[PDB]
Subunit: 385 residues, 4 copies
């Protein structure tokens, strides 16, 4: 009624990266919040409103599976619907239409606050911030990174019930394979929570046991992980590489050498996902921020604490696309799949998001060949950058 869902409109004069094809000479019709039609550009009804993308690129909006903050805010430091709204709006400037608010190692009280804020946000917004990613606290202090040792712990039976009871707003939990909490991996998976390995010093065998129990993701590969340290000690890194699970990797050139990403892409193929792991530094100009009481300084696109340990990243998805194409040498269409289609599959939202197919949600990103985002559509709502 009254065109509440909007007039139908069409993107024209774009190269369309659908995830399965690269389309030339086609137009993309949006109807309400859905991708309506993909048709020859000269068959678009003359009465449709048209967005002329001037020969640039159009793809499904990026999905960022690990995001602690951006645009000057941190979810841990300000647990509110407003923070989530700010992060969503900031993400659009870099082509990211959905994300997982990532809430790291901290007391039980804030975790329950996070659950309340997520459920409140989800009464108002769909297909944007999708669900919580609890990164910690059930980690290993030997691979704590910037996480506070005093909060790294094993799960109580009551907290296990709490998280299972609230699985409808929890997309992912990152935990250590050797933490006693790994006993509950089948319980989490049964409730629909993605279990991901991270901040873990486990051996190869112990990591594979957690994968066997149902862990299906690995959090920022190489960072805070036991590595392949010898021919006979493969660690969490080797376990993740020598498996079929999806894995996230940061492509800022600072967390992981581009050479390592080249190797990891050859091994992992269509199971390697790009995440930002971004902080308040991303999409803003700041000199420091607070991360669960620890001050993280921002200098030269590096986010590090006073001892030089990296605490998140300052990168965005479209910047990550550019680095993967230009420095890692991944072809553009495959790089895009690592930012939309593969993360969608990794958390099981791919029936409605992550690729350009008729009937899926019109979450979309337009971008140039020098990797500037021109605009986004979220639920069919186009907003130029």
């Amino acid at each position: 009624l009254y065109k509440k869902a909007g007039f139908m409109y069409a993107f024209v004069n774009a190269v369309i990266y659908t995830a399965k094809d690269v389309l030339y000479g086609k137009a993309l019709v949006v109807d309400g919040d859905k991708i309506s039609a993909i048709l020859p550009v000269e068959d678009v009804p003359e009465n449709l409103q048209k967005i002329d993308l001037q020969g640039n690129n159009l793809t499904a909006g990026f999905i960022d599976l690990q995001l602690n903050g951006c645009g000057g805010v941190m979810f841990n430091e300000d647990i509110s619907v407003k923070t989530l709204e700010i992060m969503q709006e900031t993400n659009l400037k870099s082509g990211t239409t959905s994300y997982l608010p990532t809430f790291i190692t901290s007391p039980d009280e804030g975790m329950k606050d996070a659950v309340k804020v997520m459920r409140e946000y989800l009464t108002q917004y769909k297909n944007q911030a999708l669900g919580l990613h609890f990164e910690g606290p059930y980690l290993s202090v030997e691979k704590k990174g910037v996480h506070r040792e005093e909060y790294i712990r094993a799960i109580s039976p009551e907290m296990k019930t709490f998280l299972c009871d609230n699985a409808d707003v929890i997309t992912k939990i990152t935990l250590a394979a050797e933490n006693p909490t790994a006993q509950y991996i089948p319980d989490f998976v049964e409730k629909g929570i993605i279990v991901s390995l991270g901040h873990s010093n486990a051996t190869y065998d112990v990591a594979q046991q957690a994968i066997e129990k149902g862990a299906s993701f690995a959090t920022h590969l190489h960072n805070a992980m036991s590595p392949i340290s010898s021919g006979r000690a493969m660690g969490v890194v080797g376990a993740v590489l020598d498996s079929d699970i999806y894995t996230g990797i940061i492509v800022d050139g600072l967390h992981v050498d581009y050479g390592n990403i080249r190797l990891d892409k050859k091994v992992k193929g269509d199971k390697l996902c790009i995440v930002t792991d971004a902080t308040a530094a991303a999409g803003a100009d700041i000199d420091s921020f607070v991360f669960v009481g620890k001050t993280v300084y921002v200098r030269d696109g590096k986010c590090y604490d006073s001892n030089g340990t990296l605490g998140g990243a300052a990168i965005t998805m479209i910047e990550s696309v550019k680095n993967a194409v230009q420095e890692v040498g991944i072809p553009l269409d495959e790089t895009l799949r690592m930012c939309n289609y593969y993360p969608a599959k990794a958390i099981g939202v791919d029936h409605k998001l992550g690729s350009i197919e008729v009937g899926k949600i019109a979450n979309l990103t337009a971008f140039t060949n020098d990797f500037n985002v021109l605009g986004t559509a979220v639920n069919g709502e186009w907003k130029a950058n």
Copy 2:
């Protein structure tokens, strides 16, 4: 040597698709491939506005264009017009194609090719004699009264003039095929075409040295049964390079899908174009036969097609949008593979340092922005 740079382009090198790079031209050569932010500040830049840059296209079968036909006006001026017309659709090199007709015109065409080559490099490269040593059953629009078998005198003439003859298309069942080893030894590419030969007779010609096949499917014995594979089957079941027309009228797009799957990096795109390409005409004459031009189709009185009205950049669009070949692979079918098919790939057909700066810039709706020929840039 004048130096300048192309910037703000996606560069298709034939081996890579480069983002964030610049291309530096020095005289007639590709001098450097650099991060765009490392271009020396004293170089003028051509800003390609985010569009595409690739090696200039090479058209291995081109009868005419821009309203002229090489058979009808055998002159250096004709070759100059064809070259100038070709630039508008991204084609920086071509083989002037001279079809079935009497000996005297063939000798004129050799004289004109030599005169052209006293002046021009890396443009019209050398003659493609298409015929007359063909078969009458697969003549197409070629004149039956001129289809013949070669005399020892004309065999000597052609080998004596191999310095300006790039390719000869002949029929595998024509007695002229006995001379395939002679032609190849003199440096002439032998192409199979206009031939009704059996599979076995075609395979014999390939074994003797034929290394190309002329507009696959058109004027060829087909695969007519499980047991009769003909010339088409011999070409497909071989390692030879093959040309194909991608106008959607000479060959069904589904046939091109199959042939690409079989032939991979041996399938080249040719236009086989006529006076109608790059012009707005309704008919033209082709060795005395009028050929009508209607809706991109060139056909004679019987509806036999006589060449095409297509260009290389239009063929690129059709291969990408109708056949489903990826852009970078389609471009290779228009520059890198034809370069290799005729042995000019050491200097042309790909973007690498030290090769000739024959370049084509084009948009994603397949309009050519301009070309460089021997490093000299001209916007369309």
Copy 3:
């Protein structure tokens, strides 16, 4: 009853296994395990380093071992064809009943249904090749019997779909209107003996046809750049297709091209006749005299009337003359035909829980024996 095959290279359809044993339990594949883990007291068949794979499935087979299903419509014929098949590694097949009067078709349905009350996973179901063909591509099929289906015969076939696996018909025959009806009833529809244009053949595929019968043979070919025919529609499609690999029906070079295009959709069939696995000089095939001279079956005019080849002989030719790798060739004889007719959940590959229909063979392509429903019999 439990036993294991040991000392074999096991082609499972997904992997080529070395150092493993295959345990059979009753009629099922029970376990695949390291050979040194097989208990001492478990009975073992030692395959002496030779090859083991899922039994072959022949989707087009008119007769063999001296008998023709059309000519001798009986359960005994199907038993003879099955036991003959085992000698060349073929554990399941579709009895193929060609273009002939309605009454014989009804006889075949009765016989097939009676056979299936006694035998499982062997002769699977009928292949009716014709009569709804075209006279321009009749081959040895009798022109007088090629026809368009009546509403009464359409009802009979759909009523008896429980024993009809496949129907081969021509895309330009008016019978093609009923392709969705046949498909809804569980009958595979295959294109064959058809002079259709590309467009009319693609129309039949869009309507539900999912197979093509002996590619190149009795089909309109790709006759030009612009006329792709039935051959072109099948190749430029995602449907399964059968091909004969006897070197007489189709040039090996054509099979090379067809394999390059169709990949995992190209299935090997024998299209064999009474001459396969027998020593006869001629036979009559629906009134047509077919002479047998050194492995070629042809009528007086020289038209091929079926083949004298077996599946293991086709494997050899596919490997040695076409150049297809052994593991891929075997898939064209078990896994891909199982998928083409929808029995791949129980047959066609070596996976735990599937039926133990198995074939053991040497590297010069002699069959050492078979298991059918787990029951091993050496050649």
Copy 4:
């Protein structure tokens, strides 16, 4: 020459692994020391005597690029032509027809003795022991392994001249990328010596510099190398993997976990070579041997000195083929290439050795599908096991 005159014969009833094809129904004709023809088996000239391989496999003879000893002898301990003859004869029992005698970290005098012995051996034998592999002494103390710290050193200009002057009998030198000796890599390469990286704790950058200066091989990947220890520290292992050089790897399941081999094969493709790194225990039944003053014990397939340091391998090429096929999961035809064709390419003898093609040398191995060697041909001369 009162040895047997070279004649013509054929192998029939074999599956032939040529390195480019797997042939069924073919025969292989030998003429003198050359592969003469590959023909349909029915077309074999009827006058020829025929070896019937009874349906088993036939491939080019294996080339072992790292071999310290076998059959009860160690080249370091008995620097003699007789030692090289015993190793070659022992090698035949496991399908290996060529090898590089490996001489480890030792004083200059022994190195000069080895050059002397290698040159005299090559006056008598072709296509067998091909030339020396000097593994050390220009290594690093931090990754010395079983090599004596007191002998690890940097090369003098006189010893550098000696090695370069004798490059005609030296196939390969393994050195550490951070050893000052690495400055001479271009000199060694210009003289025709393969430079391999090994026993090196170098950073990724220093290792890539050595590769840039001409190093084209890496010695037993993972073993005695700096690993990829984090996202930002890729070490020698990462430099080798993220390059196009050939590298050798031990496939005994004890030096390198099979999962690591899986990963390295996915990364390296046709650049990964199998070596044995074997010792006097290979092809013998001994409980110990001496290796430059140290007793090395043979226990449960392991070779280790009294303090438990690994000192070579007890594995043969055919056993490694079995492990690569059954434990790593590499297809048989690709596994064979890692044992003949790729090592041939790695040291530049592929024009004459390493594959079954007409005109190449008839160095051949016949083996069963339970990976027992039935026999070999060396320079066309067949000898059954």
